[PDB]
Amino acid sequence: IQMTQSPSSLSASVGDRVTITCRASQSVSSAVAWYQQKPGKAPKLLIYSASSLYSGVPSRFSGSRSGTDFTLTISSLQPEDFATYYCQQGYSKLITFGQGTKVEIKRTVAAPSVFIFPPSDSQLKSGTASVVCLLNNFYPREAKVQWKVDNALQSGNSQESVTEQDSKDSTYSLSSTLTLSKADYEKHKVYACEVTHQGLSSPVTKSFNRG
Amino acid sequence: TQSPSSLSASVGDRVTITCRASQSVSSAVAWYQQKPGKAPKLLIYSASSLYSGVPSRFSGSRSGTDFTLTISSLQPEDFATYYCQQSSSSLITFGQGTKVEIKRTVAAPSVFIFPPSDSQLKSGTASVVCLLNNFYPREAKVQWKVDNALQSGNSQESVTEQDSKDSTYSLSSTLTLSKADYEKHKVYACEVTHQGLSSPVTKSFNRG
Amino acid sequence: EISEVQLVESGGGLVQPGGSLRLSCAASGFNFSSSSIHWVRQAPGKGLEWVASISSSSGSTSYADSVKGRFTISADTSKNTAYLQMNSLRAEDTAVYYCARAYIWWYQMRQAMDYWGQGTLVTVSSASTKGPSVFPLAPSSKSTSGGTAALGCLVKDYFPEPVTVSWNSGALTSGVHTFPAVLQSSGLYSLSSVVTVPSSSLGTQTYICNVNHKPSNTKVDKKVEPKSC
Amino acid sequence: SEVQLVESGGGLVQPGGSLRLSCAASGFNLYSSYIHWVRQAPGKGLEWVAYISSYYGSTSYADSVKGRFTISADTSKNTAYLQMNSLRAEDTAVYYCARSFSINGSYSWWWDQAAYGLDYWGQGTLVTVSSASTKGPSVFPLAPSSKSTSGGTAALGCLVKDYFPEPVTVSWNSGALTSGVHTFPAVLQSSGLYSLSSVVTVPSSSLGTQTYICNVNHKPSNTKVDKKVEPKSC
Amino acid sequence: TLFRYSDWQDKLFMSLGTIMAIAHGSGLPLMMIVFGEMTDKFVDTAGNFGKILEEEMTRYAYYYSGLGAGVLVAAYIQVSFWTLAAGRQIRKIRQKFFHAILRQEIGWFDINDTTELNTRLTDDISKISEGIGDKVGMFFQAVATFFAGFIVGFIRGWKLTLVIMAISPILGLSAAVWAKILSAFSDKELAAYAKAGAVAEEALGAIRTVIAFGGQNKELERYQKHLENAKEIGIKKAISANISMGIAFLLIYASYALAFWYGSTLVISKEYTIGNAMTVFFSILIGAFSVGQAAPCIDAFANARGAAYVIFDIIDNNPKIDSFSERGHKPDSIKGNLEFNDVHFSYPSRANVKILKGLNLKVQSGQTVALVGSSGCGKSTTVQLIQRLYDPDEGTINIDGQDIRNFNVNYLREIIGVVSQEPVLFSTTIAENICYGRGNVTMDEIKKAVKEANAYEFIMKLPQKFDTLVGERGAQLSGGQKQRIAIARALVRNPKILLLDEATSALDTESEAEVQAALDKAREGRTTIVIAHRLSTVRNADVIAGFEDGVIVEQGSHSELMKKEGVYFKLVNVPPVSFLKVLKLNKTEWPYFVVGTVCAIANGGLQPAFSVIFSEIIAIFGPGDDAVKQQKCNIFSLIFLFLGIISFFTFFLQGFTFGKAGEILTRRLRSMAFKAMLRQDMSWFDDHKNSTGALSTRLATDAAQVQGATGTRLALIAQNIANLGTGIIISFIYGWQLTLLLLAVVPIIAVSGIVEMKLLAGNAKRDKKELEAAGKIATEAIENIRTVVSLTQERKFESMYVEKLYGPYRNSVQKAHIYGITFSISQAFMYFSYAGCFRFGAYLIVNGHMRFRDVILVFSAIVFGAVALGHASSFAPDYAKAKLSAAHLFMLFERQPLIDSYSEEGLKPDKFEGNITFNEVVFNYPTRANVPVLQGLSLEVKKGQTLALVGSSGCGKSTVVQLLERFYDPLAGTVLLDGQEAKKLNVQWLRAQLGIVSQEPILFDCSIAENIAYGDNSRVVSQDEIVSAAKAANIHPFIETLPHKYETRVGDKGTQLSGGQKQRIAIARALIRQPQILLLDEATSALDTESEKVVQEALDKAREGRTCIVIAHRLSTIQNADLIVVFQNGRVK
Ligand SMILES: CC(C)CCC[C@@H](C)[C@H]1CC[C@H]2[C@@H]3CC=C4C[C@@H](O)CC[C@]4(C)[C@H]3CC[C@]12C
């Protein structure tokens, strides 16, 4: 009666066999679905029963069925691809949708740009401190960002808002933000942000001084 | 039935063709301007109203037992027969109407006599005719005299319709005699009477 | 019928005193409930004369007193045709039979004769089917020359009417006076066509009259001549 | 004609607050084929919710809300009405009006319920559940560091914070300069307000040569703040 | 009587159908008498061991085949001539009926109502159609066969018929008390329940107040109360009737007990033959349970007589003033005089109020008189009573001084022509439109008098200039084009009296002058009494008039009125629902259905059981090697007893349990529908389709038909199916040969019944279409009666109907023929099947394959079994009936009204601030959305003021309140309640916080004390607090005299209280709810000036502190009212 999403975050290159293999549960018994939602929309329909496709759709969505297995390959990967995909079940009085899936572009590792900014004179008046760490044009998206306060381990105050792909170069941007009250901002001077990125051969720790 | 107020005279009168009720009924008579040889056409109803297709010269009302149609200003546009139809009973009587026309003057008639040729005599009958051309008014008499005898019963009068233009009527009085009575006679005279003639014109001949 | 007359033809023919007909005045443009169909008799030389009255709304029936009893009018609001059966055929029952119309849903009219049909002319006769004869109504030589020496040719012993009589083979008909076919004792008729002309033209030209009895399939001619016995 | 699912109502609600989510399924009628209520996790994906078939009276709620989400599919004014009851916090998903299938095109049987996928969909009113009111975003420009590199590339940017709800247009030089800039997600503030960041890199020749503006436009708070950014002068 | 409409050939259709139904019925008993010849002879063959076996057997076969042809001809002459006489009777009923409705007065028209008429006509009739169509046929066949058992028993063997006869009368008593107690109950049940109906009628009768005070719930419970008592005796009568049927079957069975043992003695006396007896059994079995299985057909005739009742009430009727006779004088010479005479006249609907109470007028022919003043003074009450719509109660009107009652009205309403008050049109061309002047109008007669109102540009403009369609109420026109065709339309009559009445008020004044002066010089000899618009176009009248309260004292000419200081110096200054939703409305009470169906399978399959009883009986009867009768057959007389008592229990059970299922569903669904309705917005009931009586019928008849499906379907169809199936099982069992062959009939009857049901539903469809066409005509007059009389053009409508009605006529012809054909097929192939399979089984025996007695068991199982398909598909018409009714009430359920009365979410403002504010509020009603309501409105009250209003008569003077109580959402503007706008409100609170005086507030089917108490539900407001508010309303000091203090059930819309009292209460109905914002529209109308002020007086030192808007167009208490708004087409002035 349920679903299992195996094909998560597959970013293979255009014109190659990119396989979405989302496995259902026991005996949904031939009720698969593979829908397309372009980023920021409602999903389309691309195929049902893993045997037939929706009218007015390209014929690159091939689903092979083996028991508890529906395996749909896309081979061309047009610019109308590289949108969000979903696998969902309709059977036995119930229907279930799965978490977002998505196919992406495959590029070469790029030079990750790391930046750090302390809050200027106007942010410190309210008693707040939002020291910002930025990682731009870093490829791929799979990266780590770590913080440090007074050369000590910092956690629980790092929110990592990740922006979406630039469709042109499939690169990425990212912003970590470390926030403290004035009750700790005046008792700690050096705030550091290291990034473990495949381009960053050694984690560079951009450190700045209070002021 | 009505009394014939058949007027056809010189121009300039208000002829109100009157129609007496055959019996005592409720006031319903319908009038027509029928052309002899045509189909009647409605002009008025209720003896007071005005049907469709009618020009505003036809009109009528009641005067006790008097059902009238009023046509004035004797014109070169007055010629028909009229008709009353009584109503207001499970049966209906009628009126015979009148016969209007235009009266130029008293016309001058020309009378002639025609003996039957032998082409008629090879069958078993023959006909001597008295023709009166261009006579008017419609009243005219024509008589035959054989051997000075006021003959009757053998004078078939065939009169034409009124001349459309000048009201000059034509008439043929045919005296038809067979193999047994036509040869026995020698003189045939036709005496005609027309009011415009001061003298009864006589056209006669002897058989030879 | 509200913009025309749709009383259409039905039952046209000829009758002998041993004959009869089921005559009809097939109304149209309205439906019988809207009317009361009437017939009348057009006796020649007299006025119009009523015969009967049916109104299929109430099925009423009022006959005249002559054609009384021996007749019947039987209209059918289904098929929309009034039906007067002329049986027991004596002589004077011949005429043209104006079959009429009426509005019964406007009592103000008070004249159930609002419309009129031409009428199926019914003709009793005597030993029909006889072709005519042309006879010269020949002018005698005493006839008025230089004035008007009328002349002509007579159609004798013919049935039925009409018979088409022409002059000069259609080259002259004015000055000819066409007389109506008046009844002969034999049930046949007689009509003359007298022409007005000075006899000085007969001294040079002769006129031929043509008679065509297509009701009897005959074409008979004769040149009328000055009578020189 | 064709299926049009036009959605109205809802979106601002406190947890414990009711609503009506309405879907004019105009272009066809509620009574031929099913009508569900898709769920769109705020950045995670989808979920199925619930559905009524009004040619069988056969309705279905969802597990974690059964009792708070009454469906009705009115067939005279042809519109779906979801009575939402108290709409708790973690249900700020987008709710799309969904149509079910027609293996022929004309209607939907009841047996083997909705077997052949949802061959028509719509665009609903994104709903959100919070207790934050309308508030104005203060922009703190995270000005380019006094450690700006000479002869290289230095970034400069600004953060907007302390507002509810979205959206804020974060642009540069009154929006005339928007090339390369990365729009970062509008983050939810810990109390319920919102915030986000936006920064762009400039070569080391145009940091002090020109002085840029971090302009922000927030319509729910009617605030269009223009703020000058500049490298730190110690 | 029903049949009272029948021509001769009608009756010959009937009688030939009835005797051929007799022969239809006598078929199968005589088939059992030959059964008995066969049984005797061939059981003597079997038991005794006859080489003629095949000979004799096929002989008997061809005998039954002869009867096959016999029942064939019988069946379809029965059905043919029955349905044909039914159809011809139907159309004649409809013609003479619709004639009568066009004949019955306008009075009767304002006592019944239109959609109620049309619905009666259509459904009444179609009910009668199936009532007397063919049902009577099945019934006469089914009583024939049981009544033939009588003579067949006697002639065949005169022994056992003796005993069974001698038992018959006591069953006479059984079914006696059956009808006695069923009738007693159901009569008491209806005589009560009709009150549960009239309370629905009176509650839905003014949905306005019932919403205006939230008091929905008190009335829902009033319903459920009277429904409580009725539903109570529901199951009781169910018992009584099922008790009775159980008695009936107990007695049949113990009767068979006596018979079986007595005749066992006889056959063991080696007397007569097994044939005579065993027949007298069999031939007395089929008939009996068959004539038993006859309930639905006598149901049908019951419904049909009930229908034809009120229809014949309508037909036989006759008024004192008639539209179809020369009932008096009809003279020719008339001058258009007309003179009122001491007229004291009042309506036959709203009888109590009298409008004209003595008017001594004078009009002469040719001279026109002007009719002007204020509205309601008597203008329309003057115009109607001239063409004698409403026979003057005591007044009289005469032309030339004699009885217009003796003026034949077919002449009266045809000589005078009153161009209608509001110009009404018809779904015609302009040609026919005006043609309704008289009918025979030649195109010139049209055009010439058409131009007399300038109707030559917009008519000669359209594509198909004249021959384009004037729509619905002229929906392809409006006032600038409509009011022109009218004033020249009935002109073409050339009325002996034209009459004008506000008839030129909807165009530019040019066309107005055209119709006015072109009919000023056109009335040279005809008068025209004018009800006009402008105070110079009133003056085109030689005399002007003053309308004063049923007394003519002031009137006259120009110099005759202005100088008199009367009025003239005063004047110038169906989305289908499912099988499932119907079947699911009854879900709580499953066990009642499980019980009904189990006892159903028993009751049904009990018959082929009788096949086995009588079959092992044959064999045991054969040898008798011992004293078998009194030693064995005693046992069988017992088994008959056991099945007798088992039948009592199983019958009573299945019948009773479906009776209780019926009660259950009916109460449930009646209540739910009533609630659902009372919840909806106001914009549902301010319509013309969803009226009061339409709704009452909707409720009652629709719940009835929702039960009629299941609450009688399972039982009857189930007897039939498990019966056929039990025979099926038995037959398959013994020798599996004969079932199949005797089931070779299942394709013929199967596809035959199927094609008949499909083409008969097709007949229903082509019929709905044809009578829907016909009823367009019908409804046209049925609604517009006010004119279709005045033009005196109803008889052409009669004829146009009749010719259309020919539609479902020929339909009926097709129906009779296809139905006769199909059911002849069915019967004849059943018989043919007996004969053929009978034959083949003969040679089967002449193998030895089947012990004869087994074949007789098989054939006998079949011959019993199929006798259950008599009306198995006869309850199908009622199922599609129910299915339609179901989809209807489901439209009534789920409709989620825009503005819900049970506001769950939103603002429930716990405090009140009386600040309402308008700023440019535009609004149009829904009904006919051409004309608007407001031209932009903007007003407001503060706390305690008095925004009074005064203007003309009906210029937007009602719609003030209906925008504040949240009936309607005003199109575009501002309306709010103290800043927090109304759309935030919880209308429940809002509605229970305001206060309204209804425009004519009714009382209910209730006492004096709750009516007032009504004003605050959600809590029982106590007894005492009324007497203050009822003395503060100065209405309690009156209860002094009333017989009971507070138990007067003031009947349906205030029967024992007058209107002034039914107004003198109106204020008290809310005061305890504390209405802080009084919205009084026509506050006090029907009282006396000394006490009439105590409405406001008793309020003067109390109205303050709480805001209000007081609207009562008078002088003593508006001249002391604060704010004023003049109504000029819907603005503030
Ligand atoms: C409620 C009423 C009708 C009681 C019904 C039961 C009666 C009518 C039935 C049940 C008991 C029966 C009797 C049972 C046994 C006896 C005695 C024996 O020698 C044979 C037949 C005879 C005489 C039966 C005749 C039929 C019978 C009389």
E396-399 and E402-403 beta bridge pairing: antiparallel
- For residue D74, list chain E residues with Cβ-Cβ distance below 8 A: 894-896
Task: Scan for tokens 């800039």, then name that residue.
Answer: D181
Residues A10 and A97 in one domain: yes
Bridge partners, residue A192, by sequence: A148, A207
Rounded distance between C-alpha atoms, residue B69 and residue E60, angstroms: 91
- Give the 3-state secondary structure of residue E430: helix
Distance of residue A75 Cα from the nearest chain D Cα, in angstroms: 23
B92 touches C: beta carbon within 8 Å: yes
Pair A123, A79 in one domain: no
Query: Which pairing describes strands C82-86 and C21-25: parallel, antiparallel, or unpaired?
Result: antiparallel
Question: E948 near E1124, Cβ under 8 Å?
Answer: yes
User: Does an H or E element contain E973, and which?
Assistant: none
- Neighbouring C-beta atoms of residue E89, cutoff 10 Å: 23
Contacts of D31 in chain E (CB under 8 A): 575-576
State the angle between helix axes of E216-268 and E274-282 in degrees (0 to 180), rounded to the nearest 10.
180
Judged by a CB distance cut-off of 8 A, whether residue D193 touches chain A is no
* Peptide bond connecting C162 to the previous residue in cis, omega within 30 degrees of 0: yes
Alpha carbon B103 to chain centroid, angstroms:
14
Q: Is residue A108 part of a domain?
A: no
Using DSSP's 3-state secondary structure scheme, residue E822 falls into helix
Same domain for A90 and A51? Answer: yes
At position D164, the amino acid (one-letter code) is F
Q: Say how far apart CA E1111 and CA E941 lie, in whole Å.
A: 13
Token readout for D45 is 């994906």
Residue span of the structural domain in which A127 resides: 113-208
Chains E and B touch (3+ CB pairs under 8 A): yes
Q: Which of D28, D54, D110 to mutate to test the interface with E (most CBs of E within 10 A)?
A: D54
Residue type at position E23: A
SS3 state of residue D197: strand
A143, part of any domain: yes
3-state secondary structure E523-563: CCCCCCCEECCCCCCCCCCCEEECCCCCCCCCEECHHHHCC
Neighbours of chain A (3+ CB pairs under 8 A): D
User: What's the 3-state SS for chain C?
Assistant: CCCCCCCECCCCCEECCCCCEEEEEECCCCCHHHCCCEEEEECCCCCEEEEEEEECCCCEECCCCCCCCCCCECCECCCCEEEEEECCCCCCCCEECCEECCCCCCCCCCCCCCCECCCCCEEECCCCCECCEEEECCCECCCCCCCCCCECEEEECCECCCCEEEECCCCCCCCEEECCCEECCCCCEEECEEECCCCCCCCCCCEEEEEEECCCCEEEEEEECCECC
- State the residue for tokens 């569900």: D36
Q: Which of B26, B27, B52 sits opposite E445 (nearest CB)?
A: B52
What is d(CA E844, CA E856) in angstroms, rounded to the nearest whole number? 13
The span from the CA of E523 to the CA of E864, in Å, is 84
Q: Do chains A and E touch (3 or more CB pairs under 8 A)?
A: no
Residues of chain E contacting residue C3, judged by C-beta atoms under 8 Å apart? 442-443
| Nearest partner of D37 among D14, D69, D13, D15, judged by Cα | D69
Domain-terminating residue out of A102, A122, A142 = A102
> For residue E152, what are its two tokens?
């067949």
Domain residue ranges of chain E, discontinuous segments joined by +: 1-157+295-315+736-849, 158-271+578-735+863-892, 339-571, 916-1125
Decide if E415 and C108 are in contact by the 8 Å CB cutoff: yes
CB contact under 8 Å between B26 and E445, yes or no, is no
Query: Do B148 and B194 belong together in one domain?
Result: yes
Same domain for A93 and A168, yes or no, is no
In Å, how far is E414's CA from the nearest CA of chain B? 15
Ligand 1 atom 8 nearest Cα: E254
CA distance, residue B52 to nearest chain E CA (Å): 6
Q: Which residues of D touch E908 (CB under 8 A)?
A: none
Count CA atoms within 13 Å of residue C96 on its CB side. 16
Say how far apart CA C197 and CA D122 lie, in whole Å.
105
A126 and A95: one domain? no
Q: Roughly how many angstroms between the first and final C-alpha of chain B, as a whole number?
A: 53
Domains of chain D in sequence order: 4-129 (2.60.40.10), 138-229 (2.60.40.10)
Residue with CA closest to ligand 1 atom 4 = E254
Contact yes or no for C179 and B120 at CB 8 A: no
d(CA E730, CA E744): 17
Q: How far apart are CA E38 and CA E31, in angstroms?
A: 10
To what resolution in angstroms was this structure determined? 4.2
| Chain A residues within an 8 Å CB radius of D124 | 42
| 3-state SS, residue E798 | helix
Angle at E51 (CA atoms; ends E50, E53), nearest 5 degrees: 75
Nearest-atom number in ligand 1 for the CA of E633 is: 20
Q: H-helix or E-strand containing A160? A: strand A158-162
CA D3 to chain centre: 24
Distance CA E885, CA E670 (A): 13
Angstroms from D213 CA to nearest CA on chain E: 40
Mutate to test the interface with E, among C6, C79, C108, C115 (most CBs of E within 10 A): C108
As a whole number of angstroms, the distance between CA E726 and CA E639 comes to 19
Cα E967 → chain centroid: 29
| Measured distance CA(E28)–CA(E615) in Å, rounded | 19
Sequence positions preceding breaks in chain A, C–N over 2.5 Å: none
Let me know if chains A and B touch, i.e. at least 3 Cβ pairs under 8 angstroms: no
Tell me the Cα Rg of chain A: 22
Would you call E414 and C2 a contact, using CB atoms and an 8 Å cutoff? no
Contact criterion met (CB below 8 Å) for E275 and E36: yes
Q: How far apart are the first and last CA of chain A?
A: 58
Strand, coil or helix: E645: helix
Q: Which two tokens stand for residue E594?
A: 């499980």
Chain E residues whose beta carbon lies within 8 Å of the beta carbon of residue D72: 894, 896
Residue E753 CB: number of other CB atoms within 10 A?
A: 19
Q: Which residues pair with D82 in a beta bridge?
A: D21, D71
Maximum Cα interatomic distance, chain C, rounded to a whole number of Å: 73
Distance E44 CA to ligand 1 centre (A): 30
Q: Which two tokens stand for residue C76?
A: 């059918």
Backbone angles phi, psi at D129, to 5 degrees: -125, 110
Mutate to test the pocket of ligand 1, among E264, E632, E637 (most ligand atoms within 8 A of CB): E637
A 27-66 residues inside an 8 A Cβ radius of D: 31, 33, 35, 37, 41-45, 47-49, 54
Q: Do E444 and B27 touch (CB under 8 A)?
A: no
The total number of structural domains in chain B stands at 2
Q: How far is CA B100 from the centre of its chain?
A: 10
CA separation for the pair E999, E845 (Å, rounded): 89
E527: tokens are 């008068």
Q: How far apart are CA C135 and CA C192, in angstroms?
A: 10
- Report yes or no on chains B and C touching (3+ CB pairs under 8 A): yes
Report residues whose beta carbon is within 6 angstroms of any ligand 1 atom.
E 250-251, 254, 257-258, 261, 630, 634, 637, 641
Count CB-CB contacts under 10 A for residue E50: 15
For E204-215, where are the alpha helices, taking DSSP H only? 207-212
Please list the residues that pair with D158 across neighbouring strands: D198
A95, A139: one domain: no
In angstroms, rounded to a whole number, what is the distance separating the alpha carbons of residues D141 and E973? Answer: 44
- DSSP H/E element including E26: helix E8-48
- Measuring CA to CA, how many Å separate E608 from each of E247, E722, E730, E856, E864? 22, 10, 7, 12, 7
Backbone angles phi, psi at C13, to 5 degrees: 180, -165
With contact defined as beta carbons under 8 Å apart, do E684 and E900 qualify?
no
Cα separation, E858 vs E871, in Å, equals 23
Whole-angstrom Cα distance, residue E686 to residue E712?
A: 37
Comparing alpha-carbon positions, the chain B residue that sits nearest to E448 is B52
Contact A68, A90 (CB under 8 A): no
Rounded CA gap, E67 and E70, in Å? Answer: 5
What are E544's two structure tokens? 């002007």
Question: Residue C111: its chain B contacts at CB < 8 A?
Answer: 28-30, 45-46, 85, 87
> What phi and psi, each to the nearest 5 degrees, are found at residue E901?
-80, -20
Do B8 and B94 fall into the same domain? yes
Kindly give the number of the ligand 1 atom that is closest to the alpha carbon of E257: 26
Counting as contact any 3 or more CB pairs under 8 A, the partners of C are B, E
Experimentally, the structure was elucidated by cryo-EM
Residues A98 and A74 in one domain: yes
Chain E residues 548-577 with a CB less than 8 Å from chain D: 575-577
Whether E1-157+295-315+736-849 shares its CATH topology with E339-571 is answered no
The sheet carrying B66-71 orders its strands as B15-20, B66-71, B62-63
What SS3 class is residue A66? Answer: strand
Give the Cα separation of A48 and D101 in Å (integer): 11
A101 touches chain D (CB under 8 A): yes
Nearest residue on chain B to E330, alpha-carbon basis: B26
Which token pair is A193?
Answer: 């942000």
Q: Is A82 inside any structural domain?
A: yes
Ligand 1 closest atom vs CA E255? 8
The answer to whether C140 contacts B208, with C-beta atoms less than 8 Å apart, is no
Q: Is it true that domain E1-157+295-315+736-849 has CATH number 3.40.50.10890?
A: no
Which residues does a gap of C–N over 2.5 Å follow in chain C? none
Cβ–Cβ gap C3/E441 under 8 Å: no
Residues B129 and B171 in one domain: yes
Read off the DSSP letter of residue E134. I
Which residues 92-111 on chain C approach chain B with CB closer than 8 angstroms? 98, 108-111
Q: Specify the residue with its C-alpha closest to ligand 1, atom 5.
A: E254
Count CB atoms within 10 A of the CB of residue E460. 11
Residues B30, C111: C-beta atoms closer than 8 Å = yes
Give the nearest chain E residue to B27 (CA atoms). E332
* DSSP 8-state code for residue E790: I
**What are B13's two structure tokens?**
């009168």
Mode of pairing for the β-strands spanning E1078-1081 and C60-61: unpaired
Give the span between the Cα atoms of C226 and C139, in whole angstroms.
5
- Round to whole Å and give the CA distance between E1108 and E218: 27
3-state secondary structure of A120: coil
Contacts of A55 (CB under 8 A, 6+ apart): none
Distance CA C14, CA C93 (A): 12
User: D172 — phi, psi (to 5°)?
Assistant: -130, 135
Name residue D202's beta-bridge partners: D154
Whether the bond into D165 is cis, omega within 30 of 0: yes
E339-571: CATH, from 1.20.1630.10, 3.40.50.2300, 3.30.470.20, 3.40.50.300: 3.40.50.300
Site of tokens 């059911």: E823
Residue D189's SS3 state is coil
Give which of D54, D36, D34, D38 is closest to D108, Cα–Cα: D34
**Helices in E283-437 by DSSP H: which ranges?**
286-292, 295-315, 379-384, 409-415, 430-435
Cβ-Cβ contacts under 8 Å for E172 (sequence gap 6 or more): none
CA of E154 to the centre of ligand 1 (A): 24
C100: three-class secondary structure by DSSP: strand
Residue E585 is which amino acid?
L
- The angle, 0 to 180 degrees and rounded to 10, between the axes of the packed helices E479-489 and E443-450 is 120
E125, exposed or middle or buried, with CB in 10 Å at 0-12, 13-18, 19+? Answer: buried
Helix pair E852-865, E692-734: axis angle to 10 deg: 170
Q: Which CATH architecture has domain E916-1125?
A: 3-Layer(aba) Sandwich (3.40)
Residue B95's domain is classified under what CATH number? 2.60.40.10
* CB within 8 Å of D66: residues ≥ 6 apart: none
Nearest Cα residue in chain B from E444:
B52
Q: How far is CA B163 from the centre of its chain?
A: 12
Distance of CA E160 from the midpoint of ligand 1 (Å): 16
Residue B52 has its nearest CB partner, among E332, E333, E442, at: E442
- Ligand 1 center from residue E29 Cα (angstroms): 28
Query: In whole angstroms, what is the distance from residue E162 CA to residue E166 CA?
Result: 6
Sheet holding E339-341, edge to edge: E339-341, E396-399, E402-403
In a domain, A107, yes or no: no
The rounded distance, in Å, linking the Cα atoms of E393 and E381 is 13
Domain check: are A187 and A121 in the same one?
yes
**B104, B129, B152 - which closes a domain:** B104
Q: Closest chain D residue to E895 measured between Cα atoms?
A: D74
Tell me, yes or no, whether A39 and A120 share the same domain: no
Q: Which CATH fold would you assign to the domain E158-271+578-735+863-892?
A: ABC transporter transmembrane region fold (1.20.1560)
Q: Which amino acid is at E1089?
A: T
- Rounded to 5 degrees, what are φ and ψ at E42? -85, -25
Total residues belonging to chain A: 211
